[PDB]
Nucleic acid binder design. Structure first.
Ligand SMILES: [Zn+2]
Ligand SMILES: [Zn+2]
Lengths: 120, 120
RNA sequence: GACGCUAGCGUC
RNA sequence: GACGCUAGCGUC
């Protein structure tokens, strides 16, 4: 069932599992312009290249006074997208409100939709 | 089902699960004189007391050119005993030869006989 | 980011 | 030892 991700630090809404996409069964990104508003970016202090994408920026919660580290932003194929680490969020079940703290995506089981270039 | 612990680094036989005893359902020690031949000690650089015992020393694989860290030696009640961390070892099934690498005792499921002072 | 590794610190 | 938290390094 649908879930939302909240910033672990300030509990601000980040996105919904419906917006989440999986790349190479290993990396997690989020679609839509709404999410772009929820984080700010910063040139990565240790940028580098690996696999199918290059690491350009660190990303953080947009909430001033929070600035919680949410992960990175990368160039993947012809796209520049955010890649997030679940450890930076609280997962909340929308129907019940039950909150879950994961450390690894491997432990978080949901409909893991694979990334599709045709979604932009 | 009885199994043997091998030094993770040099693969030397250390003990059997038969010899293992649990203290406070959290800490693991080894009975018998045979095990006493398999490790050497060195005063603990960062001693301290906690729970029911006192940390006196570190213990290492007695094999020279190995000396893999196996855990500690403590005064517990009126006992001087070794306390081992499972991640310093490789578990081997005696019947099949299958080897398992655990990191935490909670993950290792064997007949965990609790410590009995009546056994020295 | 995913994973692996070293060092240090902290609690019982 | 059982947990917990930092920092750095490496790999793709
Ligand atoms: Zn936040
Ligand atoms: Zn050894």
């Amino acid at each position: 069932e649908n879930k939302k991700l909240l910033c672990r630090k300030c509990k601000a809404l980040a996105c919904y599992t419906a917006d989440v996409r999986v790349i190479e069964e290993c990396h997690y990104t989020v679609l839509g312009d709404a999410f772009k508003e929820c984080f700010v970016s910063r040139p990565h202090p240790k940028p580098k290249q690996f696999s199918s994408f290059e690491k350009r920026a660190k990303i953080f919660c947009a909430r001033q006074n929070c600035s919680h580290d949410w992960g990175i932003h990368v160039k993947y194929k012809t796209f520049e997208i955010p890649v997030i680490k679940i450890e930076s969020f609280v997962v909340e079940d929308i129907a019940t409100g039950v909150q879950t703290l994961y450390s690894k995506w491997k432990d978080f089981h949901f409909e893991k939709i694979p990334f599709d270039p045709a979604e932009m």
